[PDB]
Amino acid sequence: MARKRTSKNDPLRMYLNYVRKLQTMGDAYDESAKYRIANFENGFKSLHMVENEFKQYLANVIDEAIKSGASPQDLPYVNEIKLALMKIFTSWLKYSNEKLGANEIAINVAGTATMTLTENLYGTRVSCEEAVSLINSIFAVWVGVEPFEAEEREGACLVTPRSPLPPVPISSPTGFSAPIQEVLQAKSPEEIIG
Amino acid sequence: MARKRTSKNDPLRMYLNYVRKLQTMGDAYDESAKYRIANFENGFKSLHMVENEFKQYLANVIDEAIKSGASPQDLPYVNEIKLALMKIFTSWLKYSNEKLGANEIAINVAGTATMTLTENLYGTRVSCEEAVSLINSIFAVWVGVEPFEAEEREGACLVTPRSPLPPVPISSPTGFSAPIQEVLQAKSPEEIIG
Amino acid sequence: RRTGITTEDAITKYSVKAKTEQTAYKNATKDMVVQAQNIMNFYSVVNQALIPWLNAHGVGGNLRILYRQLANEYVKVLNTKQSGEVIKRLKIALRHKYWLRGLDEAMLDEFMDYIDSLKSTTTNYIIFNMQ
Amino acid sequence: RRTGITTEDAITKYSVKAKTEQTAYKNATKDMVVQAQNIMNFYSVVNQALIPWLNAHGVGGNLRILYRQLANEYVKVLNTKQSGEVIKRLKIALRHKYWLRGLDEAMLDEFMDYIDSLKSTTTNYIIFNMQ
Amino acid sequence: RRTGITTEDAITKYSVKAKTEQTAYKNATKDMVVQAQNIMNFYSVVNQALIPWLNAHGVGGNLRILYRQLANEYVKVLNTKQSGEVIKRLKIALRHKYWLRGLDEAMLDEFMDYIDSLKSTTTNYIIFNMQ
Numbered sequence: 001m002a003r004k005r006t007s008k009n010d011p012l013r014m015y016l017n018y019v020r021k022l023q024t025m026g027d028a029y030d031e032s033a034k035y036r037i038a039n040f041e042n043g044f045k046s047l048h049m050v051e052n053e054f055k056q057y058l059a060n061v062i063d064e065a066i067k068s069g070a071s072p073q074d075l076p077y078v079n080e081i082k083l084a085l086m087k088i089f090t091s092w093l094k095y096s097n098e099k100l101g102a103n104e105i106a107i108n109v110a111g112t113a114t115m116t117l118t119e120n121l122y123g124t125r126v127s128c129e130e131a132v133s134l135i136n137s138i139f140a141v142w143v144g145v146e147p148f149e150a151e152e153r154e155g156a157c158l159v160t161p162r163s164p165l166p167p168v169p170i171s172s173p174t175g176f177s178a179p180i181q182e183v184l185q186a187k188s189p190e191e192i193i194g
Numbered sequence: 195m196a197r198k199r200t201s202k203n204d205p206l207r208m209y210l211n212y213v214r215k216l217q218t219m220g221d222a223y224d225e226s227a228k229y230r231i232a233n234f235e236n237g238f239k240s241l242h243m244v245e246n247e248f249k250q251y252l253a254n255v256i257d258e259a260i261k262s263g264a265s266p267q268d269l270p271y272v273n274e275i276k277l278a279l280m281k282i283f284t285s286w287l288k289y290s291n292e293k294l295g296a297n298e299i300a301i302n303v304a305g306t307a308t309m310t311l312t313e314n315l316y317g318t319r320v321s322c323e324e325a326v327s328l329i330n331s332i333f334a335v336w337v338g339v340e341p342f343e344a345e346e347r348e349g350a351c352l353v354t355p356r357s358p359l360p361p362v363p364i365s366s367p368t369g370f371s372a373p374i375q376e377v378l379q380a381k382s383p384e385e386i387i388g
Numbered sequence: 389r390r391t392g393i394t395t396e397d398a399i400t401k402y403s404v405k406a407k408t409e410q411t412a413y414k415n416a417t418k419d420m421v422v423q424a425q426n427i428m429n430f431y432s433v434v435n436q437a438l439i440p441w442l443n444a445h446g447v448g449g450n451l452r453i454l455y456r457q458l459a460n461e462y463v464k465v466l467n468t469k470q471s472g473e474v475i476k477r478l479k480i481a482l483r484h485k486y487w488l489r490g491l492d493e494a495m496l497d498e499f500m501d502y503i504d505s506l507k508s509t510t511t512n513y514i515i516f517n518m519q
Numbered sequence: 520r521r522t523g524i525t526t527e528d529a530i531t532k533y534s535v536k537a538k539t540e541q542t543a544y545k546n547a548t549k550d551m552v553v554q555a556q557n558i559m560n561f562y563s564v565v566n567q568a569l570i571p572w573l574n575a576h577g578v579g580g581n582l583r584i585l586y587r588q589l590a591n592e593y594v595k596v597l598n599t600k601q602s603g604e605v606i607k608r609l610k611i612a613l614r615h616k617y618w619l620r621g622l623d624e625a626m627l628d629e630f631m632d633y634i635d636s637l638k639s640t641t642t643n644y645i646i647f648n649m650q
Numbered sequence: 651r652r653t654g655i656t657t658e659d660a661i662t663k664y665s666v667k668a669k670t671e672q673t674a675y676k677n678a679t680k681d682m683v684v685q686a687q688n689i690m691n692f693y694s695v696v697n698q699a700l701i702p703w704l705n706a707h708g709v710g711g712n713l714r715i716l717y718r719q720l721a722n723e724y725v726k727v728l729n730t731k732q733s734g735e736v737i738k739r740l741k742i743a744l745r746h747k748y749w750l751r752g753l754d755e756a757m758l759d760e761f762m763d764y765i766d767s768l769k770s771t772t773t774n775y776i777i778f779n780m781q
Contacts, residue, residue: 007730008772009566011559016776018555020681024674026548030541031670035662040533048526052293059295063358072297072355076490080454098654111616118612119605120450123495156612160619174656181388201599202641203435205428210645212424214550218543220417224410225539229531234402242395292523305485312481313474350481354488368525439600446604449596570731577735580727 046172050093057141087116096167106165113159128157240366244287251335281310290361300359307353322351422513430509437505458486467508553644561640568636589617598639684775692771699767720748729770
């Protein structure tokens, strides 16, 4: 980037600077490819690992609830309610992916929990208290905290934290991963680097 | 991919973005071929194995029912009723092919059972209770569960689960299968890899 | 043609047809240009009937898709040319199926009474015209 | 399409599509020129309603952004075509969320009573015109 | 976008964007020609109000700049569109800040009473004109 001098609130300057720099964006993207690809290479693994860990630990908690004698019509969690719980855990991935403190992660994930459990559990058979008990069970499996206390005090559901929350136990590495054919066909280590 | 920012429900933008990207789809398909072929190579085997296993176990259950003294006019199961039962088992292949939990597989297969046994057994001599007993017998052969309870409570047939359902006992491998001529004509293992 | 075919024959077909199937997709782009506005007709006639219902009956943001799953499957059954004598059965089938995926029946009775204003969508957009 | 896909397949897609995605961005510039004035419409209709409120109710310099976070999320919920029956719930949801990030409720009750003059922004700016 | 990014990624961006950022500055010259007269408007409306005050109240040569630091920061706060309800707080903030840098308060009370005749400066000088 921004002009970094003053706000100068004026929409026509915004659109005109955008139209001016459209003749340079189309080449800066082509230049940006060369580090774009490697940063996605070592950034997508965190998403895919946290989504598989959510699937696995949700399956374990639901099966331990079924072994207590409940019916599989009592607890659906099929397509969109799992998508809600993946929304809160992926926002936990984001605020852990920055170098934030514990309670700042806790209250940002509590805000995302408020928005998500407000939106998509009206009209679908699942009260908010059961969903928040499920979220506390999943965090008891991951890091063993159970941080969130909830209420249905108004027409929406509201989530507030009780204790600070640790970041995700997954490190995003700064690697430069090379293929096995490049390892085998090379003649020297410096040919792999250089 | 989608714009991933907002919905912005407007059909003319949909058709116009499609017309804009038709001049790139025709090359992205040609580029996609190189991994398309190998992923189909190791993905079609699961379909063909589950369809042969359905044919075999249906033949075994029907022959054990004939050995109890029934007539081959009592139980047709010729062309389209087998196609119905293959619909429910192929949807079981899909929801097992994702890393879903047990009861989520159970209720999605129960929903596909509801749709399929609603559609194509009105007007064809086979009541829904006999078909659901046959499905429970086939799952007793495969994994030994018998999960589905049914009813003809309304004009359609309705299937609901009683117990969680395990995924399919078939693993889809991430291979890179090479021909035997490439094995024999090569001079080194790295010539097969590289 | 038969049915019973080995695993190798289907893979042999799909692997050897790569050149012809991609040079057929290159012409299917030309065909898709005029036929692609069935997307526009479909989302026009679905949003024009569902945005006021979902928007004024109180359902949230992310459950609107599950309601779209129900309405879109009903519109598919419609525009495969299937009128009311099958619809009076597939409505209660879809009601039980999307009740089983966690919806509430106090929404479902009103929604199944609502979906009779959705109709068929797809038309043809290429005329022959020998001249 | 499925959901469950390995880590290698997505990386293989994103790595091999580089040439086609950049030569599609080169045409998306041409498309962005006429569509980019939704930025102008958005900041016009947001500043025209928030600059007097923030400016005369006494809030500082650097907290104006946190108030913009609230107002901008509300305008997103609006111009995804969602009327009052969801808004009467998302207002108290956003009130609790931005109370939780350290605001004061004596500002929030008046601000939530204020944001009903913000409406939808985005329109379409490309007509077909077969002639 | 996130925030938390390594030291190497930012340096990698700034080093590899050199060609595009200089060929964008070459067009920003053309844009700067018509927009650069905000400098003229700014120093006109600041000197026309400060040259008689500084010149007739008795302040020296080289302290005029420190008074310009105060007045220029006030004009920045103005032309970021911020009216009196924030100004009634930032005036005493700036009074304490430039008292802390060694000025005299017998000048500062009269000068803070004086700076209400400074107003916003920057305008836009490029019209669209589709014809």
